[PDB]
Amino acid sequence: GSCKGRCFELQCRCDNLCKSYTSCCHDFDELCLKTARGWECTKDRCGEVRNEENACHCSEDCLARGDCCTNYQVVCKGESHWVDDDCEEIKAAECPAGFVRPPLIIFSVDGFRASYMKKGSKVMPNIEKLRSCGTHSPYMRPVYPTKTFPNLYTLATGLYPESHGIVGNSMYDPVFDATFHLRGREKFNHRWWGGQPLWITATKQGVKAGTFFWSVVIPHERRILTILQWLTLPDHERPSVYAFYSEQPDFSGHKYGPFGPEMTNPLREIDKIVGQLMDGLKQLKLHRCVNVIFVGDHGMEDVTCDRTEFLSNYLTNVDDITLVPGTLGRIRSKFSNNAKYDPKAIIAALTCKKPDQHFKPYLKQHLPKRLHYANNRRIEDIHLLVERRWHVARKPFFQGDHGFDNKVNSMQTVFVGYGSTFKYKTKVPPFENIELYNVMCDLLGLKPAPNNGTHGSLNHLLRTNTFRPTMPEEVTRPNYPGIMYLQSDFDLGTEERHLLYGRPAVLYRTRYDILYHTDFESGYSEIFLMPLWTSYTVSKQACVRPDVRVSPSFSQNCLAYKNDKQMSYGFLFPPYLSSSPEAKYDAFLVTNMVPMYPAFKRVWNYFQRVLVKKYASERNGVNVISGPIFDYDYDGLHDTEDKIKQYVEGSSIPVPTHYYSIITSCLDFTQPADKCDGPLSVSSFILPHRPDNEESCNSSEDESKWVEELMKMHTARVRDIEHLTSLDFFRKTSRSYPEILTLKTYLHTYE
Numbered sequence: 001g002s003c004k005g006r007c008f009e010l011q012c013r014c015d016n017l018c019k020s021y022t023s024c025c026h027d028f029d030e031l032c033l034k035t036a037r038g039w040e041c042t043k044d045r046c047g048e049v050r051n052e053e054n055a056c057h058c059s060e061d062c063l064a065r066g067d068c069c070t071n072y073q074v075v076c077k078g079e080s081h082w083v084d085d086d087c088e089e090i091k092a093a094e095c096p097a098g099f100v101r102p103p104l105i106i107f108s109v110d111g112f113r114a115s116y117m118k119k120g121s122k123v124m125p126n127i128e129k130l131r132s133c134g135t136h137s138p139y140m141r142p143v144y145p146t147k148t149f150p151n152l153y154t155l156a157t158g159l160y161p162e163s164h165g166i167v168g169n170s171m172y173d174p175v176f177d178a179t180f181h182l183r184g185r186e187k188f189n190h191r192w193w194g195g196q197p198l199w200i201t202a203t204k205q206g207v208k209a210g211t212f213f214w215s216v217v218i219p220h221e222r223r224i225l226t227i228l229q230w231l232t233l234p235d236h237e238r239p240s241v242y243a244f245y246s247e248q249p250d251f252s253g254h255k256y257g258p259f260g261p262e263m264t265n266p267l268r269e270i271d272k273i274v275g276q277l278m279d280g281l282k283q284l285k286l287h288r289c290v291n292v293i294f295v296g297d298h299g300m301e302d303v304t305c306d307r308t309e310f311l312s313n314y315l316t317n318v319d320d321i322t323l324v325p326g327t328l329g330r331i332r333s334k335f336s337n338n339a340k341y342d343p344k345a346i347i348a349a350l351t352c353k354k355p356d357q358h359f360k361p362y363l364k365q366h367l368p369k370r371l372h373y374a375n376n377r378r379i380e381d382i383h384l385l386v387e388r389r390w391h392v393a394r395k396p397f398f399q400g401d402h403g404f405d406n407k408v409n410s411m412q413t414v415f416v417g418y419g420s421t422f423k424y425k426t427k428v429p430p431f432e433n434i435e436l437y438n439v440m441c442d443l444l445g446l447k448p449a450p451n452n453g454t455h456g457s458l459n460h461l462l463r464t465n466t467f468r469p470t471m472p473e474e475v476t477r478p479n480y481p482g483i484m485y486l487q488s489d490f491d492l493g494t495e496e497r498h499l500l501y502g503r504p505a506v507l508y509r510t511r512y513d514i515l516y517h518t519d520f521e522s523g524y525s526e527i528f529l530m531p532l533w534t535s536y537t538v539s540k541q542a543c544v545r546p547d548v549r550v551s552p553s554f555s556q557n558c559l560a561y562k563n564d565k566q567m568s569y570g571f572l573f574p575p576y577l578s579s580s581p582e583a584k585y586d587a588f589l590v591t592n593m594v595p596m597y598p599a600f601k602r603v604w605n606y607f608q609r610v611l612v613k614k615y616a617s618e619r620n621g622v623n624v625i626s627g628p629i630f631d632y633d634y635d636g637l638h639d640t641e642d643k644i645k646q647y648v649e650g651s652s653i654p655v656p657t658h659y660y661s662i663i664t665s666c667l668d669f670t671q672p673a674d675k676c677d678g679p680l681s682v683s684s685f686i687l688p689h690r691p692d693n694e695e696s697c698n699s700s701e702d703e704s705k706w707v708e709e710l711m712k713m714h715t716a717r718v719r720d721i722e723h724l725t726s727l728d729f730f731r732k733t734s735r736s737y738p739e740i741l742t743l744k745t746y747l748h749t750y751e
């Protein structure tokens with residue numbers, strides 16, 4: 001066959017991907033990749049006859065045909081560049097006839113650090129306009145690992161990488177007994193690629209996507225010309241979504257570091273390509289008809305060959321393991337059934353050997369929960385977090401790299417929405433990339449497939465929403481037991497002050513009791529034998545007895561803790577904060593008691609005694625909600641009874657894998673936490689309930705030199721705690737639901 005009259009068609013091959021499969025026709029290049037006389041019109045070419053060899057055209061007939069060089073109108077008919085033009089509000093999608101929807105163009109840039117924007121109008125006048133004139137955020141949080149393949153599919157699917165299955169730029173699938181690599185053919189097999197990506201979510205809903213992926217080898221000018229060509233196609237072929245991908249500024253960034261002087265140029269070059277796009281759209285009357293998302297997959301840190309830890313310095317039988325190196329570590333047995341592979345012995349020998357050590361080993365279950373990086377068969381049990389700026393290798397030409405913890409400033413990236421449906425000159429707070437599938441679905445009138453975004457957490461990005469969020473229905477209503485039993489029946493051995501924003505909704509089927517006291521309020525699980533939440537309010541200037549409301553059948557007992565050689569107990573409401581000593585006895589009710597390992601009590605007690613008081617002076621009062629979390633299967637979802645693998649030796653007292661707190665005050669801190677009229681300020685964590693402090697290499701010193709650091713590492717979104725508990729919080733406030741969602745997606749990094 002031949003590509004004559006077929007270049008960049010929508011289905012021998014002649015579409016944009018045909019190169020990738022080594023299948024484009026003999027004359028693909030000749031006809032489809034035309035490079036003659038460059039990409040800009042110039043004075044000499046106004047008024048020419050059409051010539052077929054040319055790269056793009058500067059004759060009158062080009063405008064209909066769709067294929068003028070993007071500056072033909074500038075150079076030849078007097079018109080200005082888009083960049084040169086004033087910021088004008090787009091209050092309605094000015095589209096041509098038969099455009100059902102404002103089309104959408106996702107413009108990916110690789111390794112685009114959010115700091116690169118500081119550089120600004122000198123280096124990138126076009127991108128700056130998109131930011132200045134549209135809707136932007138100081139930065140966007142990616143996902144971990146901060147690598148390209150995991151981060152691009154998360155934008156496409158709205159899912160965490162453990163969910164969509166692209167868990168790394170490279171992975172071994174123990175069931176497929178095969179491996180996936182950036183460079184290679186294995187990745188082309190769809191079997192690796194779960195969720196429902198945006199191109200599939202649209203096809204199924206009748207909204208046309210086209211051929212969505214380009215072969216990398218095609219240059220960026222040919223790509224954007226072809227995009228403009230397709231937007232003059234008649235209404236039955238025209239796609240309504242498009243995507244463009246620049247492997248820059250990442251390529252240069254690895255070569256020169258992010259703060260390299262040699263970065264100036266690759267970014268101006270990119271802005272070249274963005275301007276061509278707006279110039280091109282303005283000459284097709286489309287520049288006030290299309291929504292354009294300028295977005296990155298990650299940023300970029302400084303990293304040199306000599307900042308490289310070696311496992312062979314820590315381990316003796318190192319030829320026995322396989323290591324996925326770089327800005328993260330993943331370790332598994334090299335050989336099949338090698339009994340001289342002991343994972344316990346690996347973790348132990350990597351733990352705190354060296355004073356200077358620049359990584360930390362985790363069993364994936366023990367990684368902070370915010371990373372949602374465990375529930376996949378291609379995440380090996382042993383994970384090494386690496387310190388920013390450092391590399392881990394196995395055995396003993398670049399200046400930047402990335403892959404680190406996604407809370408890290410250098411790993412943050414950009415987002416700019418600009419078009420008819422995006423707000424005008426609107427700066428919005430940081431958010432996570434997992435929230436972009438839904439928004440992108442809102443921009444095409446698509447119902448989003450099930451995902452990890454919180455639909456409605458981002459409606460303040462847009463001038464009009466096809467989606468109103470609604471609260472979830474309360475599955476189990478509370479009992480309010482009065483006094484019911486006597487202290488003879490036991491064989492052991494508020495809403496104005498303490499529940500400021502309404503009670504959490506229990507979103508699964510069970511029985512539970514609300515219990516009132518002077519200092520706190522609590523919802524108490526009969527199934528789990530402890531509270532699911534304890535709410536209480538410390539103001540700025542601030543023995544275990546039976547609960548006579550709860551059956552002996554449904555209570556815990558001290559005896560169980562005597563049986564268990566390893567387990568102790570702690571209290572959700574901290575006795576240390578009771579208002580009077582009369583009231584202090586309430587804190588020792590068996591219903592405020594929870595099973596804690598001694599190694600954990602050091603962390604818990606420090607938090608309760610020192611930090612809550614602290615945070616209550618700092619933020620003019622706080623309302624804390626604390627409880628337990630069961631996630632034995634590490635899916636990030638609350639556990640059913642049949643999944644709990646640990647009980648307090650002897651009993652039916654289930655052991656939590658984590659404990660959470662949600663800490664809230666008035667954002668306006670001139671008003672105390674309890675007398676607050678406007679928006680909230682929140683901070684949060686989920687701490688792993690482990691029996692050692694082997695995570696904290698400083699654990700040997702006084703709790704002030706290491707606890708608060710441990711907590712900050714396990715900062716978490718309210719939403720994360722909602723997934724883990726099946727509770728729903730902030731259901732009774734003075735604020736609009738979508739603002740509460742935004743509140744509930746907020747992560748307080750400490751950078």
Ligand SMILES: CCn1cc(-n2c(C3CC3)c(Sc3cccc(C(=O)O)c3F)c3ccc(Cl)c(F)c32)cn1
Pocket residue numbers: 020149152153154156187188189190193197213214215216217
């Ligand atoms: C199953 C849904 N799906 C996933 C892809 N997909 C692919 C193809 C399968 C390898 C790549 S990789 C790639 C693309 C384009 C060109 C080339 C090339 O070698 O020239 C290439 F290697 C990819 C990257 C990011 C995202 Cl978000 C995807 F959805 C990607 C296409 N569909």
Ligand SMILES: [Ca+2]
Pocket residue numbers: 630631632633634635636637638639640
């Ligand atoms: Ca679970």
Ligand SMILES: [Zn+2]
Pocket residue numbers: 110111147148149250297298
């Ligand atoms: Zn990348």
Ligand SMILES: [Zn+2]
Pocket residue numbers: 111148250254402
């Ligand atoms: Zn890279």
